[model samples]
Target: MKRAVITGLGIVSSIGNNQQEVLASLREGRSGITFSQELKDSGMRSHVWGNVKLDTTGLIDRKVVRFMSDASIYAFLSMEQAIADAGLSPEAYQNNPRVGLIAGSGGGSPRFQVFGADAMRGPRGLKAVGPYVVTKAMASGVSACLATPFKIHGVNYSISSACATSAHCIGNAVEQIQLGKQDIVFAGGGEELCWEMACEFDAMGALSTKYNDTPEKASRTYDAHRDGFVIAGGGGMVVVEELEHALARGAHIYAEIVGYGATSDGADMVAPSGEGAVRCMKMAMHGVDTPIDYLNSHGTSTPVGDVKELAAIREVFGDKSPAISATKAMTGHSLGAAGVQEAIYSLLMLEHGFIAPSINIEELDEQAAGLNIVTETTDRELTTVMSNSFGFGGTNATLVMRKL
Candidate 1:
């Protein structure tokens, strides 16, 4: 089996276009979340969101733009950057039948909201839905579009694991390459930030409403003041290639994907299960060569979620979980895109020699216990970092990447 390495990474989050600006925000403890004023009916207060303000006209052609959803657009942007980072010509990988695409998107773009409603209503009611409705709204559509342009014809699929979407996508991508099914792959997830989506969580009482006045302080990961999660969305991607192929091409390797671990809660759908998280982390650690030096947690800033995540880490590491940081505290939770986005941040930190902090955490929740979440900026020599993701439906996954 060939070893997998991350050659290039690309991200579109609330913080910045790429890794540098996002890393800076992580280091500065800045929050990309601002008060979401869009959804008012379900609102108690402002919700934290990492909304990117940009003109899409120049970024994509009108023809492609017509069929593309916000998720697809974000995917394209990240894909272009990742390909550029890897110095990979789409033509170069066109002949490699083993190359593939794996993508995950939780909710199809809300641009299809009207279309979906129409479809639900009646057959003729689908008039408002565009011809590319499925192509744009399908969870696997992003991967299909990504591969169509690159001519990657192998193993193209999207696995929706809720919040674990990208984590599982990247994991399955690695499995395909390791099994010799593909030599290279483009893998990640994308999510669209919108008010309608927030209203979903708001209706469920699953979002934070305490900090409408100060969105920056809303996502209190391990803090006692934490109320619930702040909805966020974006895209992040990485090019996974065989290590030998990368060395043969003399490519710059970002990180070696040593271990990919995944599990299911099996007990509860929405409730956090510390035992399940522990199992996933342990599975990931089983594939690594040494103890992880840092951890990028899936601390969603929700009270229950944060506590369970902390408990799971302690159980997995037995005090060796190493330094902990939650990138979402700064970038907001990118949902399907969360794992890849945070993984890229951790990968960059491993290369640059520092761990980004989890911003806005004060007064650790007594329920969560004291878990030493990194709140202040800290610099350290990093060799290995683990990123975790736990999704709805008890889906859980983890990956440990090592600096190469």
Candidate 2:
């Protein structure tokens, strides 16, 4: 089997719009969350969010932009960055079948249904509806929109599994490379930041309402006083290539994707289970030899979810565990995009030899008292790391990454 390595990474979030800004934010413990006035105006109980207020319509062609959702726009912005970072020229993949893309958006552009439906029912009737409404609203729009401009004809699709969407995309991309399907593939997830997403989560009682007045401190992942995840959205992508292919192309390799594991809990619809997470992590580590020096957990700051993830870490790594941190504490929860987004952040830590802090955990929850939870930026020569992303409806994914 071919070894898969990461050569390029791109991201856009509330913390930063690109990799440089993301690294800076991570190193500085800066929080991207703010009081979500839009949600409040809609009568949502949870008013804090990790909203990426930047609209990328101006960055892309109007013809393509008109068919895209906010989520697809974010992914397109990230695709540009990843292409440049990998030193990939337009000629390399313009009409090449050896290249592919698998950027995913959780629900594509859902606003079309929310806002489009109203227009269809109003005085404007069907006249206000656009020709590209279906393309913009489909779950696969993110991948299709990204592939069209690049002319990538290889395997292209989207996976929507709540919070584990992009994590699953990375795993799928790596397999495609390992199986000799493509030499290079761009993989990640994008999400739309809107009041509707927040409202839906708030309706499910899965959003942080206690820290609405103190938005910056809302994503308190490991804190005892934590409430729920702060809804966020953005795009995150990485260029995954066969190791030899990357070396031959003179690409700057960041890390090798050694293993990936995914599973369905089957028992619960929205709740988490440590047993499933533990099994998934173990599967990813089946052939891995190096000890994990850092773990980017799916610590969403929810009372049950954070504690369960901590317990799963303990079950897998034992008492003397690796350094743990949740970037979501700063970036909030970007749902399907969180998987790839957090993995990219983990790669940054492995490259820079520093563990980003899990800020706002003033008091550790008693249920998750043990384990080496990183609270401040610390220096560490990293070699191996594990990133975990679990979603609602019982999906779990783990990626084992190693410094190349």
Candidate 3:
């Protein structure tokens, strides 16, 4: 079997717009969360958000901007950065069928949906609808936008599995390369901030209302007083290329994707099961000899989800668990982007030889006992890391990476 290795990384989030800034924020314990008056004015119970501050004026071409949605812009910008970082020439992949793209987004564009719906309401509505509405409003719009620009002809599609969307996309990309089906893949996830979606999540009682006034301290991953997650906007992507292909080009390898696991709960829609999460982790580590040095958990700050993930981690590692840290406490839960962000963050931690602090956890929950949680930025040489992402509908995904 061929090996898949990461050559380039790109991130656009509330915390940072690029790799250097995100690394600095991780080391310094800085957060990008803020109290959003838009949510409050829109009648949302939770007003906290992680909004990405990006200036797309010169980032994308004017001709392409008219047809792209916010999600597409986010994904395109991150993809552009990743391709440049990988030092990939357009001539190399312009007509290459072996280059593919697998992008994921947890939710469709609610704002675009509303626009199209309102435009089709009456006689005056038809004129209000734009020609690009359908293209921009599709759930797979992000990947479509990416495919056109990069000329990707091999296995271009989108994956949606709630919060586990991006992880599964990346994991599946690795599998494709391992099976000798493709040599390179652009796999990751992107999400655009939408107040309407936030309102819906609030209606579902899936948002944090405790720290409305103190937004920076809103996301308490495994804390006793944890309520729920803060919705955020961002995109995270990586260049997953076959080992020999990357070596031929002298690409800078970040890490080697050693294992991947995906499973389903087959039970509930809103709640997760420890049994499923345990199986996911075990499958990710199957036949791997290197013990996990760190774990980026799917701690969304929910009462049920946090405890369930902790229990699953405890079951997987037993007495010798890895140093765990819930990065959502700082980055907020960016839904589909969470898994990709966390996976890239894991690789960053491995490269920097440091563990990011899990902020806002003043008191650890009793259910989270016996786990080695990293609360402060600690320096250590790391050889391997694991990142977990569990979503609604009992979906679970895990990725294991080793130093290359």
Candidate 4:
């Protein structure tokens, strides 16, 4: 079996647009959560959101941007950065059939699709609908758009696992490489903010309404005061390559993906199950012999979810639980993209030897108090990093990475 290693990474989020920016934001405890007037005007109970700020004027052609949805555009930009960062030529991927792309984004851009559909009504609807509507509305559009530019053909598909989408994408990429199905793969997730998406979750009472006035402090994952998650939008991608494939190209390896675990609660539709989370985390740690130094939690700031995850983590690590921090406190919850975004940050933590703080936690939850949750930016020698992501329908996924 071939080893899978991450040689390149690209991320766009409310907190940062690139690697350097993300590192700086993490070290400084910067919160990208802000009061969205759009959300408020849309009658959402949660006025806060993590809106990405970027200018793509020169990055891509203006004509191409018009037909792309927010997720697709983000997918394009992140892949562009990732491929370049990997130091791989477009021709390299184009000529090779062993490379593929797997993106985790599905039906999260309903607003864009709805507007396009509504614009096309009756006789004028045909013209208004345009040829781009299908591409824009398709859940696999991000992967398809990425595939067109690179000409990859090994295995190209999109997975929809709610919030665990990206984690599953990356885990599947690792499995593909380990199984010798493909030598190289691009895996991650992207999400676009829509009023309808927020309203749906808000209607389910899954958003943080208490901190609408204090936007920066809206997402308090694992904190006693946490209400619920703040909706966010972003995209992230990592270049996964076979160890020898990366070595042949002299690529700088960030970390080696060692273990992955995925499980389903099989019971709940939205609420998380501690038993399932425990099993997933333990599964990820199955082959890992080294001591885990840090944990990047999927703490979505929801009361029940955070507590459940903490209980699971404690069960898995016992007395030697690694230092933990919920980065969603800053990035909010980017849904499908959250997994990959957090994975990028976890790799960065290993590369930089520092732990990013989980800010806005004035009072830690009593159950989580026993764990080493970093509240401030702390320096440490981290070798093994475990990142977790769970989603709706009780889906859970975990990834474990070790220093190369």
Q: How would you encode candidate 1's per-residue C-alpha lDDT over 199-316 as one tens digit per residue?
A: 7777787888777778888777877888877888779899999889888988899899988889888897779788889989888888477778889999888878888888888787
Candidate 1, after superposition: displacement of residue 392 in Å? 1.0
lDDT of each: 0.81, 0.89, 0.89, 0.89
Off by over 4 Å in 2: 53-57
- Model 4 lDDT per residue over 1-404, tens place: 78999999999899999988999999999999888999999998899999889976667676666667888788778888799889988777775779989996745478767877687755687777777777677888778777776678789988889889999999999989999999899999888887867898999999999888889998999888899999999899999999999999899999999989999999877689889999999899997999889999989999899999999988998888899999999999999898899999999999999999989888888888678889999999899999998889889899999988
By lDDT, the better pick of 2 and 3 is 3
1-404 per-residue lDDT for model 2 (tens digits): 89999999888888899989999999999999988678889999998889885756479888888888888888888888888898889997778888998878776766876777877888887788867788778889899888888899888898888889999999999999989999988999888888766678889899999888899998999899999999998998899999998999799999999989999788777789788999999999998989999999999999999988988888998887999999899999998789888998999999999999999988889887768999999988999999999889889999999987
- Per residue, candidate 3 scores C-alpha lDDT tens digits across 1-404 of 89999998988988899989899989988888998989999998899998897787878877777777777788788888899989999987667989999997888577788888988895777778868887677889878888987789898998999899899989989989988999999999888898867888999999999899899999999999989999998998899999999999899999999989999998877799889999999999999998999999999899999999999998999999899998899999888888888898999999899999888899999888888898999999999999999998899999999988
- Name the TM-score of candidate 2: 0.98
* Regions of model 3 farther than 4 Å from truth: none
Clashes of 3: 0
lDDT of 4: 0.89
TM-score of each: 0.94, 0.98, 0.98, 0.97
- Location of the lowest summed lDDT over 10 successive residues in candidate 2: 49-58
For candidate 2, the lDDT comes to 0.89
Backbone collision count in every prediction? Answer: 1, 0, 0, 2
RMSD of each: 2.1, 1.0, 1.1, 1.3
Model 3 TM-score, 2 decimals? 0.98
